[PDB]
Amino acid sequence: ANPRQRNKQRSGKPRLTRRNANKKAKAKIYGNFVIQQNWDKHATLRQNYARLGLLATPNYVTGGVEKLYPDPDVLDKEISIAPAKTEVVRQLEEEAVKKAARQSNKMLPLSAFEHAYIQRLINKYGTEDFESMAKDVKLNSKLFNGSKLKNLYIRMKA
Amino acid sequence: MKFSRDVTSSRRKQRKAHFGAPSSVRRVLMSAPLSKELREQYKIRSLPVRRDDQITVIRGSNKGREGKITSVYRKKFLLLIERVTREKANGASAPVGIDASKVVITKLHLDKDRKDLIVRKGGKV
Amino acid sequence: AVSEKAGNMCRSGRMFAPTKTWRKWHVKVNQNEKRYAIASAVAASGVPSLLLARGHRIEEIPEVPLVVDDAVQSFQKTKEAVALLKEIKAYRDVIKVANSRKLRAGKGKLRNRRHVQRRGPLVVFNEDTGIVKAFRNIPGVEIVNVRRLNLLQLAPGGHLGRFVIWTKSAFGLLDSVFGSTTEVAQLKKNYFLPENIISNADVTRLINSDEIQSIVKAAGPSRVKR
Amino acid sequence: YVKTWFNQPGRKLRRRQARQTKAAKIAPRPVEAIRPAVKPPTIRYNMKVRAGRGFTLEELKAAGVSRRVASTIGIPVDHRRRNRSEESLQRNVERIKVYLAHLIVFPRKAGQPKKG
RNA sequence: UUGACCUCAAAUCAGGUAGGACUACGCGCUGAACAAUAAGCGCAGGAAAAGAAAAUAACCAUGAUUCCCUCAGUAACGGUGAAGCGGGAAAAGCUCAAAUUUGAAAUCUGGCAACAUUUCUUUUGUUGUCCGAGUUGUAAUUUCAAGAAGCUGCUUUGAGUGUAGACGAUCGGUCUAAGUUCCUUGGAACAGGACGUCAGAGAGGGUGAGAACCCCGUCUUUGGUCGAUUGGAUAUGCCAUAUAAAGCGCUUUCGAAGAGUCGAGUUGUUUGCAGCUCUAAAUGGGUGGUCAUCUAAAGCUAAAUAUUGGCGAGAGACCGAUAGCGAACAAGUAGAGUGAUCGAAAGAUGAAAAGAACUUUGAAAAGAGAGUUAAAUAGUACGUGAAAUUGCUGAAAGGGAAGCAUUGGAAAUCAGUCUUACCUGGGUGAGAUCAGUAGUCUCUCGAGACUAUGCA
RNA sequence: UUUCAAUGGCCCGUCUUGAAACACGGACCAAGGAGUCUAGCAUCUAUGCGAGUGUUUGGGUGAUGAAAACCCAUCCGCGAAGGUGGGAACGCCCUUGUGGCGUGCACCAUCGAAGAGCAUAGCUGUUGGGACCCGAAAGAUGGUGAACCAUCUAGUAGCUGGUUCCUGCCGAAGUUUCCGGAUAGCAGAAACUCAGAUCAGUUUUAUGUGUAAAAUGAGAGUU
RNA sequence: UUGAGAAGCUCAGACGAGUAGGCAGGCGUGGAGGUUUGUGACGAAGCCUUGGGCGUGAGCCUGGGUCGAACAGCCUCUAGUGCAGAUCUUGGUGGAAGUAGC
RNA sequence: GCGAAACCACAGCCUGGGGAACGGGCCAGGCAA
RNA sequence: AAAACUUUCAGCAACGGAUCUCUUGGCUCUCGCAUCGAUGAAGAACGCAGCGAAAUGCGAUACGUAAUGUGAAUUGCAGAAGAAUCAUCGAAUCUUUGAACGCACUGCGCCUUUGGGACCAAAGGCAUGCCUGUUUGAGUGUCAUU
């Protein structure tokens, strides 16, 4: 119809074709390797989350969920977790424990500067009157507060 | 039945493809079978035609009479066979054309590229 | 439709009433009408007469409704389906459809509508494990799940009585997908099978029974002489 | 000016396909974020309960989640909604608490300089 | 004076950027007919715009925007004609101005030097130094949802560089089942019969007629394999400027909030917007019902949504050469018009050109022989070749009509022909559904199909 | 089949006109060519359900076209807000039949004061939309060299010309009356109640031409 | 007595103009799902023909001649579906006419 | 020798009467070669 | 009354191009994607093939080269035998014009560089507005300034 469409239909140049149409094929899973391995490539995400023990939506389903077979005083209280209903959820949960196990050393050491910084304060103002040792300014060059001085005292221990 | 949306099932579009195809796409459209004993020797079913390939015509008025392929006439999908000719008015020979899917290849022209093609498709010499 | 830019009697003119895309293409039917038409469609696939009268070559089928065991759902090769079909003597249908593969009449075949042929048996399964890829290449044989039975596949052409080949797992689910006239289908919510105008649909039994023929008055001649 | 709904089955499948790529990108987490329970603001529907936009700041603090992290573990925030009735605070705090019961949190690696 | 700082200029001073095109969707200005309508003009993107309340509401209150459904042809107006509500799709939040870093412009472009880096020798960075920008304010910080500052005691952390594998995304090559067996008609077998084979492949097309099995494919492929190019994660090596930076908490200390704007009179436009006349406030100001809600005059922002254009793709109860596009072809083409503009007609020999050698007549054009072909009742004026219309021949008829209808006749021509079979009699040889008979097969004793054997 | 013989028959369509007269349109043949598509409303019928009803905004799903089919969450729309007699049908009889005794639907009289929709499809009707097809100078915007071009435009019509196959049944009115109309009437189409009931472009009888009560016929009356 | 396509078969009587208009049953075209285990190079569709038939009719079936690749009956679905006119559109073709004439 | 356009339902003896023109078709007539 | 002429019907030949069959075209709906130009786009003109009538293709590297493939054809002929009126495609080439750019619109130049064999030729650039910066100078500046 159009001039631009029609001149290249008559010409001899090949058409810039793209065999892109793959209907009915879903998006292959990347990201978490565990779920990818247990991801059925044919089932829909609502079916696969359910088969894997995961909630696709914590919010109300707005429709009619499939029936494949004929199926027969508290603000202080805390919900004591939810046991995993599938092995695959336990696989995800087990990795969470191991990843936290590696990242367990959250205590930091001290560098040389703050090391001798805390010794100079400690050997002069004891070890208990942290407010008084924050009140001094001759040695408290940076003018730290009592709260941060105690943190350095704890961190220097280990 | 076709299931890919990458393929088409259109008489208009498939014929457009057939007669809009260039030579490097026409060289696969013009293929030929292989003789039964040779077909199993290389374990391949059909190979594209080629000049200087010894073939036997199986269909048409020129059924049975053998020869080679003098030159493959790609722009009309024909095979020119020596000694398979026609007497014109002036006594000359206007060699008739046979389509590549009628003849059968008996003796191939063994090129270096053909040998690789045979072993590429899980075959052997 | 036609090009909106493009009188009716003039050459190179605007034909009367330009075809418009907003024509009514899709037609609404109430669901309870659709379930009735499909419960009826399933019922009429168990009556052998309505199967022959639709053109199905089931003169040697061992039994109607034809049910097989669950092992047909685990088929893998279309040699196997032909192996099974030929031992249930249902292959007459497929050999009928193969011989009925004409070329369409008219300008249809110029429009990706090239070939025609009859409809073969219908295989209703319950689980996909290789049945759908076994039987599919067999000409005519259509495979459709129990839970999504389609009226264009149980009443093709509008005509009742398609030859269905159930499986045991699919047949056992029929009591749950449709329900009963008293209970309700577990899978179709609040759906009860239709209740008929009459119980005994055979009238000649209603009339020629004793309880009526004992009270009718005398009988005249069927044809009165002139 | 006339509109036709021929792409209605096309658009629905495009939406489903758009949900599946989202699930692919974010595997463990749900495709949908949690929403609170609120009541429609009219005499006609006031006895109803539906979803809200997000959890107010009193709903986060009472449940025990800071407002900054809540945006990261998928709990959404509504600075505009407020709690006037305690039953509205109660129905949404327990909604958070049941969510944190089923919430597995993947640890993230953290920079640990040699000094401090 | 010097020379600073301010302005003023120029230079082929280096580094740049703007224009025109497209316009289906999109954002503005503007506009008459017949209506934010066409047009006219201006500006963009893969979407544009809009957008985190100076928003509703009177509720158990909701909570950025956008689209859909309803609310609803409702209210209101006077037929025009909504919005909350509700239900869905999608969701994500934010950055400045107003604070003294003042115990230290901590910020940044450009030149130069090396270091790197690449869709890339074509990209994009860092380090060092020098110069400028900047104190008429560039960073950090804070944005009302708060927050600043002091305090407390718990919880936290990379804008690095590799390697390795897994996963994905896009491009490219590649791996891929079975008849061309017999018989008949035909120019040709792809047909009809027969015997087979494959089938995750009986879509479609080609091939000398309808080809699952001759060819391309198709199915396996929701994939193996080999390459490259990248994306977000994992694993792990190295480097970390952390004396640092956050969240929650407690506050005997604090808390800045956008002006020719809002608002009023007045005049245009179509309620807002625009001009003109004036022109404000600080628990104020806007809007709703003494109350409720909101926090304007600054800024950004995905997805849900649109799409008669562009790059491709798949289909159709669509048209089938006077149709469907104006164009199945040399189609905006010839051609028409000073010009803007306007604008057609036109598809099919055959399987193969085998496209008619040659002889002959003719100045040739062409004709006649002759040839090819299955066919020339396919000869390039080429598929079938209708009607109108014209020429030749044969027939009957034919004093200013014709014309048709009935009834026949005549000429001319077709309809359609059928004693043949039935019954009875005998003989002759038979067979079987029959044996004063013997076996197998499938059914349900006997019902079939048969194989012997005898012919009563 | 052609032709002849005897008997016959004013050109078709439109419009006009009681009718014609007419005036139109018709050189011939082929092809093209005109109540269509849609939203709203009401009616009739068919179907599903029935104090209910409606899956298709959307979500779930659909491996063999996956734009189909199949399934249902939250709303929402539209609905929901007593006696007397005549009576359909039935039973009991009992001189049976005749009728009576009853029970009395729909409904109608009387006195009075035990929801029927919703949705889909069709038909006909109506209102809009380019609105059966064709035809009236336009006008406006914007351009080109008073003229001309392109679009808005499917601008406007009570009017003009045309509007396409067969058979069967019924078949008017052609105008009162008030007042462009609402009536009526004629024709139908449905629902009713009766032939033991009413009638009649009827005729008599007779009372005072009207009225009232015998024959001749027909079943008659309603909404 | 076989006469149950109960939508069938059978019996009896009267009747038959028709515009506007109302009602009903059918014939035909393109395509659509079903079907005829339909037809077709031993000749589909089409076309012509004073061949033969069928129907009141719309229409239909068939013989011959040409012809050469497709097509149809039945049940439903569907619509750009039926022509003698519109000084109708397009193409073709006559008389006028070998005339006006050049 | 080269060669239109207009026009065209179809025609073309009248005599009279034929009521509505009727003559261009109908009936009586003659004519009609 | 026969011929001629006029008329009907049949045979045959012209004429015409309907019908029937299809069909590398149209239309319609859905679907995926984001991509022009001062680094010269869209458009136009002139060129170019062993020969093209249109038509495409291409730009003096002209119906294209490099590179990666495929592996022997182009085809009316020619033509070579890594062939190919082939595919892919990341490298170069890409005539005059056109927002169109030295002034003008054919011509006329300017500047610099390269060179020729002081002058000339070729090449390069020489369009305007605006932005960041550099240099140069000037203002009737403000000072500064003993």
Swiss-Prot record, chain A:
Q: Where in the cell is it found?
A: Nucleus, Nucleolus
InterPro entries, per the entry = Ribosome_biogenesis_Nop16
Instruction: Determine the domain of life of the protein's source.
Output: Eukaryota
GO CC, alphabetical: nucleolus; nucleus; preribosome; preribosome, large subunit precursor
* Any one Gene Ontology BP term: rRNA processing
Q: Tell me, in one coarse class, where this protein mainly resides.
A: nucleus
User: Matching Pfam families, A to Z?
Assistant: Nop16
- Keywords for the protein's UniProt record, in alphabetical order: Nucleus, Ribonucleoprotein, Ribosome biogenesis, rRNA processing
Region described as Disordered: 1-23
Give the record's subunit note: Component of the pre-66S ribosomal particle.
Function description? Involved in the biogenesis of the 60S ribosomal subunit.
Q: What family does the database annotate?
A: Belongs to the NOP16 family.
Name this polypeptide is given: Nucleolar protein 16
Curated annotation (Swiss-Prot), chain C:
The superkingdom of the source organism is Eukaryota
GO BP field: cytoplasmic translation
Q: Which GO cellular component does the record give, naming just one?
A: preribosome
Q: From the Swiss-Prot or TrEMBL record, state where the protein is found.
A: Cytoplasm
GO molecular function terms attached to this record: RNA binding; structural constituent of ribosome
Keywords, sorted A to Z: Cytoplasm, Ribonucleoprotein, Ribosomal protein
Q: What miscellaneous comment appears in this entry?
A: There are 2 genes for uL4 in S.pombe.
User: What job does the chain carry out?
Assistant: Component of the ribosome, a large ribonucleoprotein complex responsible for the synthesis of proteins in the cell. The small ribosomal subunit (SSU) binds messenger RNAs (mRNAs) and translates the encoded message by selecting cognate aminoacyl-transfer RNA (tRNA) molecules. The large subunit (LSU) contains the ribosomal catalytic site termed the peptidyl transferase center (PTC), which catalyzes the formation of peptide bonds, thereby polymerizing the amino acids delivered by tRNAs into a polypeptide chain.
Q: Which family does it belong to?
A: Belongs to the universal ribosomal protein uL4 family.
Fill in the subunit field for this protein: Component of the large ribosomal subunit (LSU). Mature yeast ribosomes consist of a small (40S) and a large (60S) subunit. The 40S small subunit contains 1 molecule of ribosomal RNA (18S rRNA) and at least 33 different proteins. The large 60S subunit contains 3 rRNA molecules (25S, 5.8S and 5S rRNA) and at least 46 different proteins. uL4 is associated with the polypeptide exit tunnel. uL4 interacts with its chaperone ACL4 and the nuclear import receptor KAP104.
| Domain-related comment | The eukaryote-specific C-terminal extension harbors a nuclear import signal and delivers the ACL4-uL4/RPL4 complex to the pre-ribosome, triggering uL4 release from ACL4 and incorporation into the 60S ribosomal subunit.
Return the protein name: Large ribosomal subunit protein uL4B
Organism for this UniProt entry: Schizosaccharomyces pombe (strain 972 / ATCC 24843) (Fission yeast)
Q: Which residues of the full protein are shown?
A: 53 to 312 of 363
From Swiss-Prot, chain D:
Keyword terms, alphabetized = Cytoplasm, Phosphoprotein, Ribonucleoprotein, Ribosomal protein
Q: Does the keyword Ribosomal protein apply?
A: yes
Name the source's superkingdom: Eukaryota
GO molecular function term, any single one: structural constituent of ribosome
- In which compartments does the protein localize? Cytoplasm
Please cite one Gene Ontology biological process associated with this protein.
cytoplasmic translation
Give the signal peptide range.
none
Which Gene Ontology terms of cellular component type are present? Answer: cytosol; cytosolic large ribosomal subunit; preribosome
Ligase is among the record's keywords: no
Q: What is its main location?
A: cytoplasm
Subunit info here reads: Component of the large ribosomal subunit (LSU). Mature yeast ribosomes consist of a small (40S) and a large (60S) subunit. The 40S small subunit contains 1 molecule of ribosomal RNA (18S rRNA) and at least 33 different proteins. The large 60S subunit contains 3 rRNA molecules (25S, 5.8S and 5S rRNA) and at least 46 different proteins.
Which family does this protein fall into?
Answer: Belongs to the eukaryotic ribosomal protein eL13 family.
Provide the function of this protein: Component of the ribosome, a large ribonucleoprotein complex responsible for the synthesis of proteins in the cell. The small ribosomal subunit (SSU) binds messenger RNAs (mRNAs) and translates the encoded message by selecting cognate aminoacyl-transfer RNA (tRNA) molecules. The large subunit (LSU) contains the ribosomal catalytic site termed the peptidyl transferase center (PTC), which catalyzes the formation of peptide bonds, thereby polymerizing the amino acids delivered by tRNAs into a polypeptide chain.
The protein's name is Large ribosomal subunit protein eL13
Q: Which organism is it from?
A: Schizosaccharomyces pombe (strain 972 / ATCC 24843)
User: What taxonomic lineage is listed for the species of origin?
Assistant: Eukaryota, Fungi, Dikarya, Ascomycota, Taphrinomycotina
What fragment of the whole protein does this chain represent? 21 to 136 of 208
